Design a binder for this molecule. Structure first.
Ligand SMILES: OC[C@H]1O[C@@H](O)[C@@H](O)[C@@H](O)[C@@H]1O
Ligand SMILES: OC[C@H]1O[C@H](O)[C@@H](O)[C@@H](O)[C@@H]1O
Length: 368
């Protein structure tokens, strides 16, 4: 029989620099689920497809015209396995971050355009959105053609009319990384006069990126990015998965990075290795971490959380299309003086949670 002693409890204490806890609002989640009946005339297919009928997940989030806007990854029924459908982005708006008005057709999708060899048939996956102080939204996303996933950039002033600029790493180093399999780009931002905007460091834009390791890149124009490289020209690893912890197979960038008085915070997704990971957590689960970098030297790693701050807790987080579970963190909005987090739930649903700095919740508990 348990005795309920405090010193044996499952608290998960955060360092002072870390965001959280993020509390799921009672009864709210999932906030975006598939809809069977909504059809789209696909300009590639030349017929109507049920574009959000399978799974709706891995979302971007931003602020526009006084509302939270989410662009959600939506998959059709054009194939069975993971990565075998076509991904297109849905559009939804909310004044409370919980109840959304969705558009019935997608806003971003593969088309008869400059990117068709890179985006057909897999489409456009896993967006992250940040905005300049001058009002240009910058989207990082994955192009998927069933051969190589590529990290790419699109821009817009209104979140509807998007210009595709192609792979982020197309141009640098005489095209060395054009064919690099890559994804998950977190541009550096800062809250200025209450609004989260893209932030320059040393006169250039900055992005953390990657799935298997955390890498970095700079840009002068927000579309052509130059990775940081080692002496021999290989990609320079800022940090990597580690034995014994939740972030043991992958350390995959999450939402845009945030410049704070303690340093730059990168919120990211860890995948737990069955062989090398933390056996207190489910093998192969994705659970979220945070890393701190030097404010004056953005590639200089300081520390990371030892335990995830947010992990699968509800049924639709614990299992779904991705059977081993995810809380795949990807969007954040500073809104009404709180932080609204948007995440994929097991590659199937969209969830949200709120960190209120004035009334902070606990982090998700240890299993342990
Ligand atoms: O990018 C191609 C595919 O890569 C897989 O590992 C998953 O991330 C899929 O959701 C994606 O469709
Ligand atoms: O399938 C789990 C997970 O795989 C990748 O590592 C991610 O980039 C996401 O696309 C997806 O949510």
């Amino acid at each position: 029989x348990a005795s309920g002693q405090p010193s044996n409890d499952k608290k998960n204490v955060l360092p002072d620099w870390a965001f959280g806890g993020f509390e799921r609002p009672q009864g709210a989640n999932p906030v975006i689920s598939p809809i069977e009946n909504t059809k789209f005339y696909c300009p590639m297919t030349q017929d109507y497809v049920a574009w959000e009928s399978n799974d709706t997940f891995n979302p971007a989030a931003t602020l526009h015209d006084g509302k939270i806007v989410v662009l959600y990854r939506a998959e059709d029924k054009s194939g069975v396995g993971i990565g075998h459908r076509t991904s297109r982005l849905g559009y939804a708006t909310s004044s409370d971050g919980i109840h959304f008005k969705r558009e019935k057709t997608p806003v971003f999708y593969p088309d008869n355009d400059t990117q068709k060899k890179l985006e057909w048939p897999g489409g456009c996956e896993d967006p992250r959105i940040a905005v300049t102080a001058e009002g240009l939204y910058v989207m990082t996303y994955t192009q998927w053609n069933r051969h190589i996933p590529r990290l790419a950039i699109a821009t817009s002033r209104n979140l509807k009319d998007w210009t595709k600029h192609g792979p982020a790493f197309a141009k640098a180093y005489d095209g060395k990384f054009f064919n690099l399999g890559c994804k998950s780009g977190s541009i550096l931002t800062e809250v200025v006069n209450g609004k989260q905007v893209i932030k320059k460091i040393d006169g250039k834009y900055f992005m953390y990126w990657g799935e298997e390791h955390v890498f970095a890149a700079t840009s002068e124009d927000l579309v052509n990015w130059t990775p940081y490289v080692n002496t021999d020209g290989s990609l320079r690893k800022l940090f990597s998965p580690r034995d014994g912890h939740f972030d043991s197979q992958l350390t995959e960038c999450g939402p845009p990075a945030i410049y704070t008085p303690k340093g730059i915070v990168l919120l990211y997704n860890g995948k737990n290795s069955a062989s090398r990971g933390d056996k207190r957590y489910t093998a192969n689960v994705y659970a979220a971490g945070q890393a701190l970098f030097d404010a004056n030297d953005p590639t200089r790693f300081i520390t990371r959380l030892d335990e995830p701050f947010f992990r699968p807790m509800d049924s639709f987080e614990k299992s779904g299309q991705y059977v081993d579970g995810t809380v795949f963190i990807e969007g954040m909005v500073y809104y009404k003086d709180k932080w609204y987090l948007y995440y994929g739930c097991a590659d199937s649903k969209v969830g949200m949670a709120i960190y209120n700095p004035k009334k902070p919740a606990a982090a998700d508990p240890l299993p342990a």
